Amino acid sequence: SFVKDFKPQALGDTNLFKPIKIGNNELLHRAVIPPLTRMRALHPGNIPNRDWAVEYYTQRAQRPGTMIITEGAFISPQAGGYDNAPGVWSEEQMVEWTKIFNAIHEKKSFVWVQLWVLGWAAFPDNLARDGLRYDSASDNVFMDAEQEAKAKKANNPQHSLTKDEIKQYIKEYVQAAKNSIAAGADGVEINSAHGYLLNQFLDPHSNTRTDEYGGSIENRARFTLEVVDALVEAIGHEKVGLRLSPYGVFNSMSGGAETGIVAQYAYVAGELEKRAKAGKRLAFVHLVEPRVTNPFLTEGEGEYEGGSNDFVYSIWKGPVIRAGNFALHPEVVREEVKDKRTLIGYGRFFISNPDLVDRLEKGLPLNKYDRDTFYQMSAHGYIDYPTYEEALKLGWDKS
Ligand SMILES: Cc1cc2nc3c(=O)[nH]c(=O)nc-3n(C[C@H](O)[C@H](O)[C@H](O)COP(=O)(O)O)c2cc1C
């Protein structure tokens, strides 16, 4: 069915539908598909689903000039920990990724691959199964109760990365970025948000190191900046974007309770723009909004008013994508896009509406999303959401 008490608003007379150039890509509009894990990848091998992947993406790449940011993908075996999330380190993985990339392109849309590294968010059992470590910045702070229960049951303790293992992850980043480009992706996105490894180093609560990787705004931000600097040399700055979540609390991150949280992030921005002046300006900066501090909280739940993302605009002068409870607040997006370099990432509503863009343009009703199939091994709740026409044919009230 459609969203019940939702009063849609046509957004075609806004900047959301004005073209803009991101990297080498020329989008026909500014409503992007943010990275979304759906757990349909095949085990073993973390192979992208060969039965439904192309169809799912293809349905979403229907409105021409759309920028699609893929589900997070592990850059390596030690970077993962989820059996059904896809990888981007093997041939078997890349063969299926090329098919995907082609279909999106055939529909005249673009595709950026999110490079993923779990850190303490990965299941220790899975890693221990395959003889892998349970990595993280520190080893005297854990994610949560069950995460430590799992870790010990499987006798796979949290391991503080050495400077050499940190370098190894950087190797793995470059390579994954190359195979993504080599396979035909328009560029990659560095996931340095939602509490995964990179964020785990940025954050003062999770990072209690004393070396060159801990102890100061400069040191915490070091691992993140070294990936940006490594990927920029391997595939070029206009094929590299960074995703951050300043006020995120997901996966045990500090957020607005950390009095120095803003200073930590203003520092990352300042350095990104520094490089921008040196010619090397990243394709974008993706920003998860405080509106949502936890993706698995209903729209409206986990809203942080004590903080804002606006400060980034003062430092970074490039394109900035914003994701966070925008679908049901067109009146908010209206104001937000009045700014000239801002894109809106729609997540939960891009799952249920493969034709979201047109619905957004025309202020047409939205399809309710089924929270239960987000992470299901099924095609249902995956590729079977109907477009407006079909919902009308189904009679989701209007026959
Ligand atoms: C099913 C699901 C999976 C997600 N997977 C990822 C992920 O792989 N990486 C990422 O950084 N964000 C992920 N997100 C967060 C989205 O990118 C987006 O920021 C979030 O849904 C908030 O926007 P919304 O209100 O439009 O959904 C996910 C969200 C959902 C609901």
Side-chain angles (χ1 to χ4, degrees):
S1 65
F2 293 131
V3 181
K4 297 299 151 55
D5 324 280
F6 171 60
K7 258 67 184 175
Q9 193 182 139
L11 257 42
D13 57 348
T14 63
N15 286 339
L16 188 82
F17 291 97
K18 291 293 182 291
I20 184 182
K21 196 211 217 325
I22 291 306
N24 295 149
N25 308 169
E26 302 187 19
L27 331 193
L28 275 39
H29 58 110
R30 304 166 187 214
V32 337
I33 297 182
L36 297 164
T37 291
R38 309 277 267 103
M39 299 292 191
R40 265 84 172 174
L42 312 172
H43 171 83
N46 292 113
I47 316 303
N49 192 301
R50 307 201 192 82
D51 305 327
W52 320 312
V54 179
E55 186 57 28
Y56 163 87
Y57 275 110
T58 294
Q59 298 172 351
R60 272 123 204 97
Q62 62 179 259
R63 167 75 99 111
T66 301
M67 161 180 202
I68 290 192
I69 299 181
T70 77
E71 56 207 86
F74 309 129
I75 73 177
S76 108
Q78 175 67 89
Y82 303 143
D83 286 333
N84 301 285
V88 73
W89 71 86
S90 73
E91 286 180 50
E92 191 178 45
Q93 274 152 7
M94 297 321 313
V95 173
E96 308 301 320
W97 275 120
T98 303
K99 300 207 214 162
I100 306 192
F101 296 159
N102 291 157
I104 287 170
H105 287 320
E106 112 219 322
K107 297 275 181 162
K108 289 132 67 174
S109 288
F110 317 92
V111 65
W112 297 61
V113 170
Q114 176 168 259
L115 296 186
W116 212 10
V117 177
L118 310 191
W120 71 9
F123 299 140
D125 49 319
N126 290 337
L127 296 153
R129 179 190 62 212
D130 306 331
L132 300 150
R133 307 181 230 115
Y134 182 42
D135 303 328
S136 189
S138 317
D139 63 341
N140 51 255
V141 190
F142 308 116
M143 186 175 114
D144 62 44
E146 46 191 282
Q147 274 304 261
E148 69 176 81
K150 276 187 186 288
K152 201 54 212 67
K153 192 80 64 292
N155 193 48
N156 203 174
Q158 193 156 310
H159 161 89
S160 287
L161 290 175
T162 58
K163 293 185 171 185
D164 286 276
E165 305 169 315
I166 280 165
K167 288 181 253 196
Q168 177 59 234
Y169 264 110
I170 293 156
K171 266 47 177 177
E172 295 165 346
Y173 266 104
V174 169
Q175 196 52 248
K178 285 171 169 183
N179 318 158
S180 301
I181 297 306
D186 297 309
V188 306
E189 178 188 82
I190 303 187
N191 188 348
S192 200
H194 305 305
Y196 298 114
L197 194 76
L198 287 190
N199 200 154
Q200 294 167 204
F201 267 87
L202 282 181
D203 205 271
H205 167 72
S206 58
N207 193 343
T208 64
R209 303 181 64 120
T210 54
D211 62 1
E212 165 202 329
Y213 286 94
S216 93
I217 307 171
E218 289 78 347
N219 283 12
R220 284 184 226 105
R222 171 170 280 93
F223 202 170
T224 294
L225 280 170
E226 280 179 338
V227 180
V228 156
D229 290 341
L231 296 196
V232 171
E233 54 82 9
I235 68 174
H237 57 273
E238 74 300 318
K239 296 211 202 86
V240 189
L242 185 63
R243 182 170 224 216
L244 278 8
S245 48
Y247 298 108
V249 295
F250 194 56
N251 274 343
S252 299
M253 288 303 109
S254 306
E258 173 45 56
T259 51
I261 214 68
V262 161
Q264 172 68 69
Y265 283 94
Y267 173 76
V268 158
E271 291 283 304
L272 256 39
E273 183 81 6
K274 189 172 88 167
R275 294 161 175 74
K277 283 157 175 48
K280 281 70 193 65
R281 184 187 295 258
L282 305 187
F284 62 107
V285 167
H286 201 351
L287 289 171
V288 176
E289 289 287 282
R291 276 173 72 82
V292 186
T293 48
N294 176 306
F296 301 91
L297 288 184
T298 317
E299 260 92 350
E301 295 190 35
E303 233 122 58
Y304 186 67
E305 265 72 68
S308 141
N309 264 336
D310 294 351
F311 74 90
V312 176
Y313 288 85
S314 268
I315 308 141
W316 172 250
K317 300 298 179 181
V320 22
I321 305 170
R322 274 162 104 169
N325 185 21
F326 285 120
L328 307 161
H329 301 83
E331 73 287 339
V332 173
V333 172
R334 174 155 240 106
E335 295 308 302
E336 300 298 349
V337 303
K338 281 181 193 173
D339 173 87
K340 58 229 87 267
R341 58 182 169 124
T342 295
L343 303 77
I344 301 300
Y346 296 103
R348 296 178 266 184
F349 284 102
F350 234 130
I351 280 171
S352 48
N353 304 279
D355 62 323
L356 180 63
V357 183
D358 303 348
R359 299 197 198 212
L360 247 27
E361 183 188 59
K362 308 172 199 168
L364 296 182
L366 274 33
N367 284 355
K368 282 177 185 294
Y369 61 79
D370 174 49
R371 48 297 314 205
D372 297 305
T373 52
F374 278 8
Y375 305 137
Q376 254 296 5
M377 182 64 77
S378 59
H380 179 242
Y382 198 41
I383 54 198
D384 66 345
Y385 277 99
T387 57
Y388 190 57
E389 298 286 352
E390 293 152 10
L392 283 195
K393 295 182 168 176
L394 297 200
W396 290 8
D397 276 305
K398 234 308 294 73
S399 314

